[PDB]
């Protein structure tokens, strides 16, 4: 959010990542015209929400609330292109490169998904699908993508050439869950879907704000699986802070019991492609590693990585090893605040940084 | 108040006979302060007994409808009940 893009080398798994160079935008990059197509300044003047690295390796693309996409050469860390979104309302929330391709899919807040070809620096087409802002987009090798909108609570699979979409809706009922438990707890209804990832070309997984991690197939409108309150429930508010009366029993009554408890939001979620391992991160102070079963109907919790403390904004996994023995590095960009807003308050012991976990198979 | 406590779709034929009773059962005593009872007989070969909730007394803070159906071989044309016994004639 300090308008800074920093390049790191992460090659040595034993050592810490090493900073090579940085580019910092400032207030000097504010355009003088502000006429929505003169917004072609070389730097970012507003906060940068998302970044993507092109699979060939020559370009890195930054986008944020300044309503532009800046393509930078990796060697000089200098802008080779700036692309305005040409809309007053569209802020680029998420970027996703098609795997082994130059094609970039950007999800904007004006209910759009813009596709660019970066080598030609052109825009192929724009897809119009969501009732609310499109927070996250994920795309595998073939020319299709999955987007999530926040308060429409839908996940959309877009066929890029055919401009068609499959719509997936959750439709969970806490009364129905309570009845099911009574036939057989706290049930929080789902407010917004934030993060999405593609396990393969048939399965994708979405994290919501009520803590739900949902495993979806293309053949089923409903989720196949739902893990509810996956990260946990937020701490109870302080009883001396909530009321302000002298009587501690009145303070405990004003706590109002279990009703004011709210769950953690899945702020980041990454599925290693064509594999059963996926990682979910929230500001609980621990990443979680999950395994999808071989029948692909459910997933279980393998492990918990307690190194990172703070809001987990983005999780990436890289591989460096032989086919017999692979070494995985998990990098999470830990921040004190959510990338969209400053809603989350005073999380304890959070530092801005990069969290790395190096996992070796047996 | 010139209004009905309750109405029943009692029989399918004509209501040929109607009387108001105070039933006296061996096992139990009906609550005659809270409930009133009436017998009816019709051409659908039935005599039926009904209980009605009544708001005359406020001594307390049940069932309205069919208690017992008396079934006969032929149609019934009139009904009357005994003034001190449980018996009645159709």
């Amino acid at each position: 959010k300090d308008l800074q893009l920093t390049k790191y080398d992460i090659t040595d798994f034993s050592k810490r990542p090493k900073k090579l160079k940085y580019a910092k935008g400032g207030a000097k990059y504010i355009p003088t015209s502000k006429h929505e197509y003169e917004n072609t300044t070389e730097g970012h003047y507003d906060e940068i929400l998302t970044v993507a690295a092109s699979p060939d390796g020559k370009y890195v693309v930054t986008g944020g609330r300044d309503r532009k996409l800046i393509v930078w050469s990796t060697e000089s860390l200098s802008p080779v292109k700036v692309i305005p979104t040409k809309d007053r309302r569209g802020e680029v929330l998420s970027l996703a490169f098609r795997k082994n391709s130059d094609q970039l899919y950007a999800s904007c807040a004006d209910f759009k998904i813009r596709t660019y070809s970066i080598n030609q620096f052109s825009q192929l087409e724009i897809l119009y699908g969501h009732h609310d802002i499109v927070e996250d987009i994920s795309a595998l090798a073939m020319e299709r993508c999955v987007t999530v909108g926040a308060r429409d609570r839908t996940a959309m699979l877009w066929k890029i050439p055919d401009e068609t979409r499959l719509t997936f809706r959750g439709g969970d009922e806490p009364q129905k869950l309570l009845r099911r438990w009574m036939k057989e707890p706290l049930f929080f209804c789902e407010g917004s879907i934030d993060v999405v990832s593609m396990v393969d070309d048939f399965h994708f997984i979405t994290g919501s704000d009520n803590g739900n991690i949902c495993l979806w197939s293309l053949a089923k409108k409903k989720p196949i699986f739902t893990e509810r309150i996956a990260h946990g429930i937020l701490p109870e508010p302080s009883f001396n802070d909530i009321s302000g009366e002298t009587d501690e029993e009145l303070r405990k009554r004003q706590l109002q019991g279990k009703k004011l408890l709210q769950p953690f939001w899945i702020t980041s979620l990454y599925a290693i492609p064509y594999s059963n391992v996926f990682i979910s991160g929230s500001w609980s102070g621990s990443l979680k590693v999950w395994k999808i079963s071989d029948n692909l109907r459910s997933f279980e919790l393998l492990g918990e990585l307690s190194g990172a403390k703070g809001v987990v904004t983005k999780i990436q996994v890289v591989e460096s090893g032989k086919h017999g023995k692979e070494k995985f590095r998990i990098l999470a960009s830990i921040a004190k605040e959510h990338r969209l807003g400053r809603w989350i308050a005073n999380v304890s012991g959070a530092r801005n940084g990069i969290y790395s976990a190096v996992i070796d198979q047996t | 108040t010139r209004e009905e406590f309750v109405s029943f779709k009692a029989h399918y034929g004509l209501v040929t006979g109607l009387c108001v009773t105070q039933p006296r059962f061996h096992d139990k005593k009906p609550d005659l302060k809270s409930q009133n009872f009436m017998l009816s007989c019709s051409d659908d070969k039935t005599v039926k007994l009904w209980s009605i909730n009544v708001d005359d007394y406020s001594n307390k803070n049940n069932e309205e409808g069919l208690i017992r159906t008396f079934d006969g071989e032929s149609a019934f044309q009139g009904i009357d009940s005994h003034r001190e016994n449980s018996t009645f004639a159709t």
Binding site: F187, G191, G341 | -
Partner: protein
């Protein structure tokens, strides 16, 4: 009972937050306790949302009394963070007001939510 009464259910909270978001998009929503009191004084409020987890809880308890005076429906939602995300601002919001606009595209949804709130009260 606690001072934050009534408190809406999960489904009702989701409906109210979606309505708040749509009114914020259509500029029919006034954000904050002071602005809610101003709209209650002008008489343009249709219903009032408060947040029950604010510390302290007393700083918004004047809104129910003005709501009872002006016959304005009012409701409490559990999370001020969720209320802020629904309003779309970067900071938490402890109280919001749905203003009156006759030529509003979401009048049916606002009226349905107001009907449910009046059912709660």
């Amino acid at each position: 009972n606690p001072k934050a009464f009534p408190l809406a259910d999960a489904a009702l909270t989701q409906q109210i937050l979606d309505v708040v978001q749509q009114a914020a998009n259509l500029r029919q929503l006034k954000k904050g306790a002071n602005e809610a009191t101003k709209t209650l004084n002008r008489g343009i409020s249709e219903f009032i949302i408060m947040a029950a987890d604010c510390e302290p809880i007393e700083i918004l308890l004047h809104l129910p009394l003005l709501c009872e005076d002006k016959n304005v429906p009012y409701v409490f939602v559990p999370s001020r963070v969720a209320l802020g995300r629904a309003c779309g601002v970067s900071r938490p919001v402890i109280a919001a007001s749905i203003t009156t606009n006759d030529a509003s595209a979401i009048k049916t949804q606002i009226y349905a939510v107001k009907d449910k709130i009046e059912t709660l009260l």
